[PDB]
Amino acid sequence: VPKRDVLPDPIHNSKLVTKLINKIMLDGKRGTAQRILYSAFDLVEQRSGRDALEVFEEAINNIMPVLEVKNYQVPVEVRPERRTTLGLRWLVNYARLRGEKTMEDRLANEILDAANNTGGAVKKREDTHKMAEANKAFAH
Amino acid sequence: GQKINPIGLRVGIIRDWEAKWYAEKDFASLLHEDLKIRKFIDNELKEASVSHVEIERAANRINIAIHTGKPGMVIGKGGSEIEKLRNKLNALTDKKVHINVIEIKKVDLDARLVAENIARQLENRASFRRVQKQAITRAMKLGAKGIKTQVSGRLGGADIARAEQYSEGTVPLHTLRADIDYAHAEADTTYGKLGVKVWIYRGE
Amino acid sequence: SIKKGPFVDEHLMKKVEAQEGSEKKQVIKTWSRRSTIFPNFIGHTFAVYDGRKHVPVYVTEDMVGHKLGEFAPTRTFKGHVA
Amino acid sequence: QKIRIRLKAYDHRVIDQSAEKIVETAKRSGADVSGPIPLPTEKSVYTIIRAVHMYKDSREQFEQRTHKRLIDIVNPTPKTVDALMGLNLPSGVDIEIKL
Amino acid sequence: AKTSMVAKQQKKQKYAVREYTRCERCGRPHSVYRKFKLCRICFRELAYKGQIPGVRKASW
Amino acid sequence: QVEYRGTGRRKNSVARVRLVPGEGNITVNNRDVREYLPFESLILDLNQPFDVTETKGNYDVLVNVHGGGFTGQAQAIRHGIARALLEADPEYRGSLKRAGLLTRDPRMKERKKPGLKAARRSPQFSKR
Amino acid sequence: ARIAGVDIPREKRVVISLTYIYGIGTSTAQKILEEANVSADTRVKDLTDDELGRIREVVDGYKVEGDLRRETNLNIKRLMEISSYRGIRHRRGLPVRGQKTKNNARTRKG
RNA sequence: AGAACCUUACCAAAUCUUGACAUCCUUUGACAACUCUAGAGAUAGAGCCUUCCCCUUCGGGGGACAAAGUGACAGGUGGUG
RNA sequence: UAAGUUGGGCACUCUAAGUUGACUGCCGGUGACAAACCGGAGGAAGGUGGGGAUGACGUCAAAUCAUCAUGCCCCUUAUGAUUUGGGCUACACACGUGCUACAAUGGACAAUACAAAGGGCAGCGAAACCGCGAGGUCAAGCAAAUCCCAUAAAGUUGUUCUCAGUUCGGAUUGUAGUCUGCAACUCGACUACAUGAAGCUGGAAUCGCUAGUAAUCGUAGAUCAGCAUGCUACGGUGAAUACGU
């Protein structure tokens, strides 16, 4: 039941960066993951120059799903914490699957595109919407 | 295993070690020398039913204390047999010894003594059941907080390995402030081996 | 690996020295597991005991890629159908 | 000068009693006895398989306690030597007198 | 069998390193401790017997 | 002047935190924190003592620390700072009890049990 | 290619070009950079007059055109010519030091 | 919780049969270190030395054995959880 | 003072043995008022703080006569045994475990930091010299909070490789050396060089993890004359997830 959450963050402005540094921490190594996410921060602040807070908030406010499934399938209301966690997990999954050249070009493109409410992020969003709305036959 | 001899866990907390000497990296020599005296103990075991011995190693001297079943002839009439035992031990262990015989607790309430008693009684073609009844009767007469004796193997001249237990009173095993005496013995007449483990619970 | 130079047994060497002083012999019963290739065994034959029966094998002139310790596997058929 | 000793027995009770009697005997005829300096008391490790023919994963843990106790006495005198050599009935202690 | 191994390890050896530290009371070839010259099970048997003054398990 | 003392013991890391007057800063082993502790931009947590305790008057820190990892050493500074703030005056003892970071965390690496491997993973199941 | 051997990738760094084919190899990188100075100035082929001045001499002793091929060919010729105490285990994939082959997949074997 | 030999229980060869080992009786006794030879090695022949060391009132015991005879035997990783 | 090497103290940490302490021991509410339940305060430990040994009756004709003993049957000039070779490990193979990569969170290069535990007397080899490295050689201290094994890796500080069967990758064999072993071939390990297959996260199925957790990266010990991708112990970074049966 307890979550053992972590409050502080090197960039105090957003606490989602705690989840970021935690999930990108694969293979037990933190320094390089934090370095590459800082690089993504810098590039997204550079490409289409704006504060990364607004583009990140657009990504974390447009790619949030409302339809999920929990041999029967039923749509279920999502808790906000689980919704944000799944969104960040999908963001890191897109970062892995894109497989681009530089450390952070994929990450910055992902966050910018999600802020645009277009791309594979919204493609997965509508996949969740239509897959769950197909399961509504068990709601009654 | 499911059940392990509790005196293994008991030692080091309330009770002392079976063998005691000074600490050094040359423990192999000390243990291999002590094994010879432990095997030699059987000579006094077969006639006096000594429960066990605590052996001590002084700066250059060895001190032992046997728990005999009766001190009269282990000490001799006036010391007619202790000197030859000391000499034999000195020859066998290649070092002298300081024998200090003490009689086991006056009541036959200890573990190894009664274990050997019932082992010999079984080997003498006596009903293990009646022997156990007598043993538990005198155990509760003498006064003990808890006593059980298990047996295993081919009892009563059979070919089936069965086990029995006959306990009495409160016998806390999982409890550590128990101060118990676990024993073991082996007995047979013509059929295999018949192991017995006598347990004594005297005071807490 | 290699120590004390080439490894020998110092008794097969006695037999080979005794049989090499005269005309060379083509029959030598031996075990040949603690010996190595060296130029003094040229022109001779050895019967290395693989474990069932020692089988003579003649020494060739190109003993750089072969060792006299083993000529055939002691695992007959090498424990396989093929 | 000073005289230091090192004690090794597998029971902290016998070592504590031995240190106490050694200190008392040394201070009986003199003074300036340094106390029972504690030392880290490293241990050992013995992993023993709790089986005979199978069951390697089921094991048992053993060890060997190695207790080190250092007591110093300054201004050495033969009286403290006699006090130290008085009696070592808990011979589990490994009396190693040094200077 | 091992009845001749108990003497073979005690008999002469062809060179310096030809023997193994087998158990003394036991004859178990494998899993022996060179510090005590006793096998795996013999150490446990005597430790349960309290012969060695060493401390008990469950001290960590 | 007066100098307070505190200590932090967590994750087998002990920091002998000594507090001195000044602008408010640290010298880990007479050295700066930024390069001694690798990738330690987390000093926001380390200065949270100044932002939440004793108004915002920063107090210089001298720390001699050995043992444990760099992150465990960093969190060990927090315990010593909090202890020094406690012993300065008991007024904020209750607030620190209500502000967190005062109850020492006894959570350290535990023992290794048989059944695990290089990855601390329990044995598998007899499948197929 | 032009420098030596058979073919060399174009617009690439020297450190991988010298190891693209049978040659000096990249494990000798420290030795070659200690002896010679021609290295990966940049990821493209910047071979100029200053370059190749002495790297060819430094690597000259390592004649790798068909030397490894002839060495291996003569080794296998001796293997299948002379008694094959190793040749018998060379069919099953066993080295001189042994492999204890149990998972004989279809890579080295038919 | 250590398979090159020893390791290992199997095969082949050199091989003995109270046997490789150990005890009980006696001829008795501090147990042979090193070399040459036949022998794949074992083992065997020897040169050589092991060699009352402790009590010894002179033996003897023990105490080891150098080899031998003796009836038991020892032995089985032969089997049976 | 390069450095706790030195004079000075045990101040801090740490260091081993006595003592308080988390025990429901207090408050409010709930609860048949009781037990008990919930929240709280104090409090490091709030509802047994965490981890480890202690595994009831018994079930499995579960395993061990091959630790040992063990009744019975058999060989006992062989079913006992001295010595030499191998063999338990062979491969059209399959199996399960474990190790290594499929990568650019990465690889490669250079400066740079944090740990505890264990063993050590002929063993642990200070410094140093040599060598292509393995390692060769000489050499300090130490029956151990002194000295050694022994450096912590990731990580911080800069660079390069730029998406390829890749500066990924080391399976494969060949050449020349090193430690130990009289002996490294069935049959140890390591090194310097070359060669460079598959594998670009894996289908149905499928295992593991609830907090200092997994995952990851290092260290020490036994096993050993030398040989650990196996085991144990120690240390570093360090997350979300349990709404609900």
Side-chain angles (χ1 to χ4, degrees), chain F residues 10-80:
Chain F
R10 199 193 160 183
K11 206 199 62 84
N12 57 275
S13 166
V14 179
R16 301 173 272 180
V17 187
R18 167 196 174 186
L19 283 302
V20 280
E23 315 169 3
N25 206 7
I26 69 101
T27 45
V28 284
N29 311 125
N30 322 323
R31 199 193 176 185
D32 163 68
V33 58
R34 204 61 189 88
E35 82 293 334
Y36 189 132
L37 286 81
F39 220 109
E40 194 63 20
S41 293
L42 271 46
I43 316 320
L44 174 63
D45 167 271
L46 282 276
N47 52 65
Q48 278 172 341
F50 321 117
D51 319 291
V52 75
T53 89
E54 267 78 349
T55 66
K56 219 269 181 183
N58 296 13
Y59 200 69
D60 189 15
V61 195
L62 171 48
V63 278
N64 317 111
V65 51
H66 60 283
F70 80 109
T71 320
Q73 289 195 15
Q75 273 54 80
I77 317 290
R78 169 57 163 149
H79 289 100

Side-chain angles (χ1 to χ4, degrees), chain G residues 12-13 15-16 19-28 30-31 40 42-43 62 64 68 71-72 75 78-79 85-86 89-90 92-110:
Chain G
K12 307 297 195 301
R13 58 207 182 285
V15 292
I16 189 50
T19 84
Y20 189 70
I21 62 160
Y22 279 56
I24 181 55
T26 193
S27 99
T28 59
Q30 310 295 333
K31 319 190 197 66
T42 183
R43 69 168 314 187
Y62 314 92
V64 196
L68 172 43
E71 191 171 353
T72 301
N75 291 310
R78 161 192 55 195
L79 204 87
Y85 85 119
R86 289 176 179 180
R89 274 197 278 137
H90 216 146
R92 299 121 166 164
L94 287 136
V96 288
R97 233 178 289 197
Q99 209 182 1
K100 305 159 172 54
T101 69
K102 292 284 249 147
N103 53 354
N104 291 59
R106 311 222 187 165
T107 307
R108 209 48 187 77
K109 195 77 204 316

